[PDB]
Design a binder for this molecule. Structure first.
Ligand code: HEM
Ligand code: HEM
Lengths: 735, 734
């Protein structure tokens, strides 16, 4: 293939054949080397929360609203108002989110980097970002690009007559393309870009509910669905099935989906004035003269009446700069006929309809009503039809649903409400925020923590292995992409996590009963002090790690940060939490991978979501094995004669050349370590164990911890990594 | 299919990536390697302190004993791993290319992809595994980089060849160095060379046409093909490849013959079974192999069944002891072309003595054998004269080999101030880019304050010239081989003083002015003396400080005294030719080639300076604000306050009222036109405009263009300036 190869082969700056070219199936650590603090121009010590709280937020909003109608000659505003274009920018920034893996969304501002800056569906959003740049120049570090793109759409809706619930800032900027996201395996974009995600099916009605997991778009390079219909076939009934699937994969139900589409398509228009052959390279492929912009259009000045974005030429309402109910009115009251846009694409026009839809530049010109196939979807499915019919007669119910769904869209990947900043954060708490009760009571102090650690360690049924394993099981549900999971809330005690087979539900039950005894004893006796179950789960694992280090000859402070609260079941939605359930866990030697995701690839992926470096992933696995911390208490990977003592025995014995390693099963998941001289079977290992002795960069770390004399360094590094992981969700304190 | 896995992972980076869609776009990956977070020792680990505390003699004693402690999983030929360990060290050091300074043993990269899995490194996985117990014993106080070389050094000495000594000091690295251009072919040897010979298969005519800056005849080889060019068993053509490849590694004829005749005193090659019996290389092998590869399924895969290169040659009758048997055999035997057991072309003395030993059976003997690359040395007129001389005067070979082996192992270690341990050779060699002892006593802060005031009021000097000259001197530094930088004032010597990129007539007038400041100081300050090298850096540094003051920011710009001035005798014009830049984005110099755009050359140079993307970006914008172009032009100088340290370069770059269009056919010149007045306002280069085009670089430009960030700009510039000026300061250190 020519695909993925430049016709000129550079000899500079990484040019040449590379290791991943020769050995493309080998595990890559790239996803654990992103987002490092050197790469950040602002430095590691910059506190975005402090900066945003000092922002003159009201003046930022007034500057945005003034920009909306200050038309720039290099991209003139339709109807004299950029509001629709700015709503699209915000919706596309937020619109990449996938609920199952928690990736995409607006929370990293990734629309400004490859590949999102150059996806076909983001065509001419380079102009939109450029138009808002002067607001970022004025306000500097005190508002992120990530926050600004979404605030701009929020302010746009409010200045076009639609009052929102409010807004929360808090998204710090990122500084490189996030190459950890599986957007798909296709080698083409829309109109192609979907053979792999449909497994070669082309029957568009039958396949619609069979989109490859965890994807949430129907072609590579789209936000959700194809506006001409599935595979460009202008069938509204099949389009509706694609919409249900895609919006479902983004965490939206039918009410939310109709409210978002009918709410957004009140505003603006689509652009399809000239054929695609007039349009130049996307931003990542454009020449230096374009200075970060792309899709240069060679007809006229390439803008104004010649704008070309999607290829469609649809104006939904008679007032595209003002909130209305004209979208549903047109959709339901007109009869529709299939026509072509000027650029050749399929759309729908009203039969015998009024010629009163305004032109964006010529006051003398009007058009008939028009719709996309994906808008006709909403009256060609029974459930969408019933919602649209109700909202035709009750526009106030659409406005309520749209306010709620728009707020959810923009904030779904922001994390707990302790992350949300600014003066207009909505007061209602929503289930998709994974709510927590407010912390109350006088917080436990150092002496209470010392008393609780001793009580925990002296309780029947609690040992170092079980305490450590339970804490980590609770902690590794965290993922940095959408800031969901972690130990705050004590959700391991609730459905679904209490019944996850990867948590060993019978053992977990007995551990949690013992912790609840510690809790009853303490609460029953220490005046104004109560301790949460969440702090006891974390404190028990922390106490176990401290004890295991002492038992290994090292006196170390293992620091504990108190103040977690306990969630209720009503704040813990089963569907949302089911997305956090692991299929394999390398920290606790659970499960295994599949053909397209090997055991060790799942481990690296999870480490990236925990923000771990390669040294931190390595040290954690080796210490969990030394602690005997497997999910089922097995000996797999437990390469030590001192289980429960925090030593680097795992690494020492893994690298010992007197042990030969051979496959025991057929499927490559189980390994036996045999003493070469005696021929006795000494050890059993998994792929998560043996990858550390196979991958050249991971093995180099294994060797550090296997070196004579490094027992103390091993202990210090394990404790640092343990503390980092236990605290990932502590946004009430600071990250 | 090439460079694609048959199974497409959906985790850990699986899926189509940005580089796949837009493979021609500039990539910043080489500025993101070797980050301190990635180093398991921590960014505060000091390798030099660890190594100086090492019990060095005990390490060498334990290496020496390991040589004859055969391990059953890879039994030692003749009972001695010495030859194997000499090969390990020579392959570690043997990837070096003098022109670009990449490869060599100084980063210990043989333990990572791709070098761990190149065909020429077959079975060195075993060699590395055999020495791992010594690394495990001594811990952090010896690096893998130092150990692999020290092991070969000790192996020579324990097989009867006393070396010049050794220097340690190579700190380990912790990821594959994906900045090196090894070539553009999509196959390894026996293929791997269509591109580097532009599809020529005329083995004599093409030999001196090898693609620059490569130093091997096929992808995956160290230097040349042991069976002849493209496997053609023609010794005279092989000799032309050896001279080309070794020259590209910085070795001349005498050094070349010494290295090959010296090395092949020892050990043997391995070709006992055909290649179909050999499994995947390390990076392709299954988890059971635990980082090893090339599993051989015949017998136990080892001992008599060893298979490495496919050849089965034993050069001397005493493969564990230094001798003159290589030359004695080469010159005196009549050679016939034969096939090894694995099917490769080699040469045998079919009517010679049957007294060459077997590595495992003391009762079994063989005839004399050679490679085609060995017969090369008697099939070229200059190599033959050397070979004949040394046959008769073997002490001259021993002298040449000790010096060339020292050069091989230490060519990328950098200045002598970096060399560690108790047996560093006392001779100063030209390829070490030597520096003297200082003159008189070290300037103090009072002397620095007087010299800054003098420099900023001297005829022929100003802010722009001073900043340009210091950066010109600094950017010769390259971290791959630790060559270049400002220590030595080598801008003032040949060849740098006559480089077109240094504007020789301006430079001369700047250097004469700094020498006048120097003459005033030296001898009127008792025994205090200042070097020209310190005055070049101090003058640029004082200019940056004043330019910040004039932009409204009061900042103390640090200065570290103590550089010395190199002599011209210690500055070889060919050695320094390798540092001459094709383009220099910091000073808006030069143009790209048919294989690398100007902006790619700049990112490459930034990687050699260890810069991050924000450091690269801030330096370019500040150099433009200072008016520090090599030729004093206004290209990229997007400010009305030239000489004042403002972020005007970034503000004006991103101003939408300016439209940028190509002016030259070559893609190298651009004009910025004011869209309202229709007037040409600015001229820019590709090094200027990339900061407004690449999305990750433009994100950094925006920071510096934002209101309020004028002081941050100055702070970040000053930090980056100090880092670059000090890269070669291993005397402090660096
Ligand atoms: C099934 C889901 C959807 C599809 C297929 C779709 C499709 C499109 C297409 C093809 C365009 C025209 C781009 C152009 O040529 O300029 C567009 C424009 C727009 N869409 Fe959507 N859309 C969907 C959902 C949404 C949502 C959820 C919102 C926001 C809540 C949104 C708001 C907008 C706005 C405001 C515009 C007008 C942009 C302008 O005036 O420049 N759409 N849509
Ligand atoms: C024209 C340059 C050279 C070529 C083409 C070449 C080729 C080879 C080949 C094909 C092998 C056999 C590998 C195997 O089958 O085990 C080998 C082995 C060896 N080479 Fe070279 N060589 C070159 C230069 C050097 C140099 C410069 C040195 C060191 C100063 C060196 C030292 C050795 C040693 C000691 C062995 C034996 C390894 C053992 O005993 O396992 N060679 N050479």
């Amino acid at each position: 293939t020519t695909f993925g190869r430049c016709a000129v082969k550079s000899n500079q700056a990484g040019g040449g054949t590379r290791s991943h070219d020769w050995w493309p199936c080998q595990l890559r650590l790239d996803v654990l080397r992103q987002f490092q603090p050197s790469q950040n121009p602002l430095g590691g010590d910059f506190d975005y929360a402090e900066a945003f709280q000092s922002l003159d937020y009201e003046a930022v909003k007034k500057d945005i609203a003034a920009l909306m109608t200050e038309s720039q000659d290099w991209w003139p505003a339709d109807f004299g108002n950029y509001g629709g274009l700015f709503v699209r920018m915000a919706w596309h920034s937020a619109g990449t989110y996938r609920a199952m893996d928690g990736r995409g969304g607006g929370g990293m501002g990734q629309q400004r980097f490859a590949p999102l800056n150059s996806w076909p569906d983001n065509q001419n959003l380079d102009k939109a970002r450029r138009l808002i740049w002067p607001i970022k120049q004025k306000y500097g570090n005190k508002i992120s690009w990530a926050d600004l793109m979404l605030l701009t759409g929020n302010v746009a809706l409010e200045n076009m007559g639609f009052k929102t619930l409010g807004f929360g800032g808090g998204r710090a900027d990122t500084w490189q393309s996030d190459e950890a996201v599986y957007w798909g395996a296709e080698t083409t974009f829309v109109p192609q870009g979907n053979d792999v995600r449909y497994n070669n099916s082309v029957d568009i009605n039958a396949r619609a509910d069979k989109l490859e997991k965890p994807l949430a778009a129907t072609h590579m390079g789209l936000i959700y669905v194809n506006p001409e219909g599935p595979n460009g076939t202008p069938d509204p009934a099949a389009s509706a099935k694609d919409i249900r699937e895609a919006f479902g994969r983004m965490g939206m139900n039918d009410t939310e989906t109709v409210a978002l589409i009918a709410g957004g398509h009140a505003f603006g228009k689509t652009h399809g004035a000239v054929k695609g052959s007039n349009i130049g390279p996307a931003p990542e492929a454009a020449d230096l003269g374009m200075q970060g912009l792309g899709w240069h259009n060679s007809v006229g000045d390439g803008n104004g009446p010649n704008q070309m974005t999607s290829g469609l030429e649809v104006i939904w309402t008679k007032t595209p700069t003002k909130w209305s109910n004209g979208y549903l009115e047109s959709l339901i009251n007109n009869n529709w006929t299939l026509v072509e846009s000027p650029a050749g694409a399929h759309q729908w026009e009203a039969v015998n309809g009024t010629v009163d839809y305004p032109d964006p530049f010529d006051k003398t010109k009007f058009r008939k009503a028009t719709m996309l196939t994906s808008d006709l979807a909403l009256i060609n499915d029974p459930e969408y039809l019933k919602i649209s019919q109700r909202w035709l007669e009750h526009p106030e119910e659409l406005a309520d649903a749209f306010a709620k769904a728009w707020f959810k869209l923009l904030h779904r990947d922001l994390g707990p409400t302790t992350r949300y900043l600014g003066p207009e954060v909505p007061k209602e708490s929503f289930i998709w925020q994974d709510p927590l009760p407010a912390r109350e009571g006088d917080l436990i102090d150092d002496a209470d923590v010392d008393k609780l650690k001793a009580a925990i360690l002296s309780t029947d049924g609690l040992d170092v292995s079980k305490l450590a394993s339970t804490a980590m099981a609770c902690a590794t549900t965290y993922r940095n992409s959408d800031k969901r999971g972690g130990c705050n809330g004590a959700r391991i005690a609730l459905e679904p996590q209490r019944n996850w087979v990867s948590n060993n539900p019978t053992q977990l039950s007995a551990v949690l009963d013992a912790l609840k005894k510690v809790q009853s004893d303490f609460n029953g006796s220490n005046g104004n002090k109560k301790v949460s179950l969440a702090d006891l789960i974390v404190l028990g694992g922390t106490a176990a790690v401290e004890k295991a280090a002492k038992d290994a000859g090292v006196d170390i402070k293992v620091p504990f940060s108190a103040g977690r609260v306990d969630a209720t079941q009503e704040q813990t939605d089963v569907t949302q939490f089911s997305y956090l359930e692991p299929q394999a866990d390398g920290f606790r030697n659970y499960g295994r991978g599949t053909a397209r995701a090997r055991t060790e690839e799942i481990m690296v992926d999870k480490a990236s979501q925990l923000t771990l470096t390669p040294p931190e992933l390595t040290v954690l696995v080796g210490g969990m094995r030394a602690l005997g911390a497997n999910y089922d208490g097995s000996d797999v990977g437990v390469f030590t004669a001192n289980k429960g003592k925090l030593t680097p025995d795992f690494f020492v014995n893994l690298v010992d050349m007197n042990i030969a390693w051979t496959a025991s099963g057929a499927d490559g998941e189980s390994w036996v370590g045999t003493d070469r001289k005696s021929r006795s079977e000494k050890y059993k290992g998994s792929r998560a164990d043996l990858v550390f002795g196979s991958h050249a960069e991971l093995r180099a770390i294994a060797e550090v911890y296997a070196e004579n004399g490094n027992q103390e360094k091993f202990v210090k590094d394990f404790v640092a990594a343990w503390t980092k992981v236990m605290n990932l969700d502590r946004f009430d304190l600071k990250v």
